[PDB]
């Protein structure tokens, strides 16, 4: 019926990119750069946050079936965003994406688009659709962060701080392979969990079961703390590696 779009961390040692001699660090950087490219390009065009995420999810899935050495990342990113626009009903003309991509990329980077940028992108649409197995509908942590937050009752200002901090973590999780590891519902819980720890908030008090210390279980069943800690560690590692710090 529907395809399985989730892999184990151990499996990422065997992506096509890895087996063509690309080391783990490089593929990670290639994914962040491609994600941020999609994020930045669509933001300049004024695109909804779901449209950006959908393109990024397509991008991350794509390179589980192909190697970065054979498919330029920035062309792939532009193709993903192009398709994402049509899927999510935020369409843009391919020429406008190329225009914006040219503005944000240096000359060496834009060389990936070759002699005819629009053609290189439009051609790739065929491969992209086949690669993602025409499973176009995608759900994102955003909708669950809000659906679950709406069921929290308490200090309006403390909960809103939790949401925005978690929302920032979702945007940051788009650069990581977590989208390929865990369903969005878990991601939304994980970012709520992380923000709670950083803000020293005890979320259970805001739930309908204030004495249920594992507050998330009412939102997402069968999630061990093991998973939420693994997710938190990966998000925090991104901040530790960069110069940026936790939003707080």
């Amino acid at each position: 019926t529907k395809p399985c779009w989730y892999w184990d961390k151990k499996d990422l040692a065997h992506t096509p990119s890895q087996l063509e001699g690309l080391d783990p660090a490089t593929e990670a950087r290639y994914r962040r750069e491609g994600a941020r490219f999609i994020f930045d390009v669509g933001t300049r065009l004024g695109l909804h946050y779901d449209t950006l995420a959908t393109g990024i999810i397509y991008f991350h899935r794509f390179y589980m079936f192909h190697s970065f050495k054979q498919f330029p990342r920035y062309v792939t990113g532009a193709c993903c965003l192009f398709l994402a626009g049509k899927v999510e009903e935020t369409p843009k003309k391919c020429k406008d994406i190329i225009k914006t991509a040219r503005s944000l990329l240096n000359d060496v980077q834009f060389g990936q688009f070759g002699d005819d940028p629009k053609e290189e992108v439009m051609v790739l649409e065929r491969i992209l659709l086949q690669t993602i197995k025409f499973d176009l509908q995608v759900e994102h942590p955003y909708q669950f962060l809000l659906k679950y937050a709406k069921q929290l009752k308490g200090d309006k200002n403390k909960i809103q701080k939790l949401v925005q901090m978690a929302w920032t973590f979702v945007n940051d999780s788009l650069c990581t392979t977590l989208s390929l590891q865990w369903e969005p519902e878990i991601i939304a819980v994980a970012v709520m969990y992380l923000a709670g720890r950083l803000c020293k908030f005890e979320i259970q008090e805001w739930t309908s079961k204030p004495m249920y210390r594992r507050w998330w279980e009412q939102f997402v069943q069968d999630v061990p703390v093991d998973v939420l800690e693994d997710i938190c560690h990966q998000i925090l590692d991104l901040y530790s590696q960069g110069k940026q710090q936790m939003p707080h």
Binding site: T1, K133, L136
Partner: protein, 321 residues
């Protein structure tokens, strides 16, 4: 696996013929070589390269893989024609083959609908619409051509190419006129642009009357002329019956000849009372006062219909020959 779409080749189907012409490509009838099942293949041509894969097809792939109902058409898989840059072949959307279409059955004039036959038809259509509306999806092009019926009496909805999600909290700008004029609601004629799921209900009400008259209720060629015909039967748009009609862009612009009174019950006196009440509610000018799909199912006309009794219509046979 069954889920890896886009790889299997169209070689697996023996093409029987072209059932009809589709907006993103022509629709062909075919038989599966492995199972023998009859299927319908919709050609999706991206060779135009103006905007790549058509969005109309994207909408149908996205929405119909989410929707699973007996009264909704099922997309079985997507197959392809036999140097990725040079490849310009097309894709095909595989669907269940339907024996007949409602417009065809009526236009040929061969079919005769009994009350019980109409009950089963409408209940299936409304159940499918309710499923879609519950899922916050709007068809936006309900027509006789898009209602498909098997000889068994099963009805499935199709052609979701103009379908889009509806947000109650955040109404957002939409296309101004999406439905065909004969089945277009008065709100779209006046340019509501922020249309509600009630646009589909009005269309299905037009079908209800057409099944009783065997002739489309409101047939015109110009948007104003349609409002005149609708106004004569349902009454002229006026603030008393449609408080927010004054907010619509073309209310002052598009006026009927007179302020006609509602005559629906009089002109449809031949319709059974249970159905006449349903028609009155479905053909209500104000979209906020127009009944919902669930409400149509909870009507004296359709609530007690048992879908086990499919009640197939009088489909083509030798005595008609």
């Amino acid at each position: 696996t069954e889920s890896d779409w886009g790889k299997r080749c169209v070689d697996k189907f023996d093409i029987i013929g072209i059932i009809g012409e589709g907006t993103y490509g022509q629709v062909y009838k075919a038989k599966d070589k492995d199972t023998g099942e009859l299927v319908a293949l919709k050609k999706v041509r991206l060779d135009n390269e103006k905007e790549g894969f058509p969005i109309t097809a994207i909408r149908e792939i996205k929405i119909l893989r989410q929707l699973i109902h007996r009264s909704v058409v099922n997309m079985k898989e997507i197959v392809t024609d036999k140097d990725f840059k040079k490849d310009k072949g097309a894709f095909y959307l595989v669907f269940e083959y339907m024996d007949h279409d409602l417009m065809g059955l009526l236009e040929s004039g061969l079919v005769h609908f009994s009350e019980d036959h109409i009950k089963s038809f409408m209940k299936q259509l409304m159940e499918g619409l309710e499923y879609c509306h519950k899922k916050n999806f709007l068809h936006r092009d309900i027509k006789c051509s898009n209602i498909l019926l098997n000889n068994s009496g099963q009805i499935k909805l199709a052609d979701f190419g103009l379908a889009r999600l509806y947000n109650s909290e955040e109404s957002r700008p939409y296309t101004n006129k999406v439905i065909t004029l004969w089945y277009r609601p008065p709100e779209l004629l006046l340019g509501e642009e922020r249309y509600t799921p009630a646009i589909d209900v009005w269309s299905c009400g037009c079908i209800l009357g057409e099944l009783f008259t065997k002739k489309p209720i409101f047939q015109a060629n110009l948007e104003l002329a349609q409002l005149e015909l609708i106004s004569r039967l349902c009454g002229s748009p006026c603030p008393a019956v449609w408080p927010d009609v004054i907010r619509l862009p073309y209310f002052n612009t598009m006026k009927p000849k007179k302020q006609y009174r509602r005559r629906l019950r009089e002109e449809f006196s031949f319709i059974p009372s249970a159905a006449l009440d349903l028609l009155d509610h479905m053909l209500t000018l104000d979209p906020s006062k127009r009944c919902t799909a669930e409400q149509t199912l909870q009507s004296d006309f359709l609530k007690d219909v048992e879908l086990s009794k499919m009640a197939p219509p009088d489909l083509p046979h030798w005595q008609d020959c």
